[PDB]
Amino acid sequence: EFTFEIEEHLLTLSENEKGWTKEINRVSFNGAPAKFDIRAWSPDHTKMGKGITLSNEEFQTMVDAFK
Numbered sequence: 001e002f003t004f005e006i007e008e009h010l011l012t013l014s015e016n017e018k019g020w021t022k023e024i025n026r027v028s029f030n031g032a033p034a035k036f037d038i039r040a041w042s043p044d045h046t047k048m049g050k051g052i053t054l055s056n057e058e059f060q061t062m063v064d065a066f067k
Contacts (some may be wrong), residue, residue: 006045007034019043022051029053 008026015021020040027037036059039051054062 002030004029004048005034010036013038020049029051 005028007028008024009023010026011024013024018044020042022038022040025039026034027039028034036054036056038054040049041047042049052065063067
């Protein structure tokens with residue numbers, strides 16, 4: 001019904017008292033090619049929290065804009 005895989009870890013932005021991290025990763029959803037994903041993760045990365053997935057074009061638009 002739904003699958004995910006962290007294909008590459010890029011950056012951790014913060015971590016909270018419960019060990020959950022906000023990360024920027026390349027994540028494959030339902031076997032699709034991995035996309036940028038900014039999201040909270042459990043310590044062993046088997047639970048995901050709220051976040052956003054961005055296409056390469058969307059992520060590049062963001063980076064060019066603020067720097």
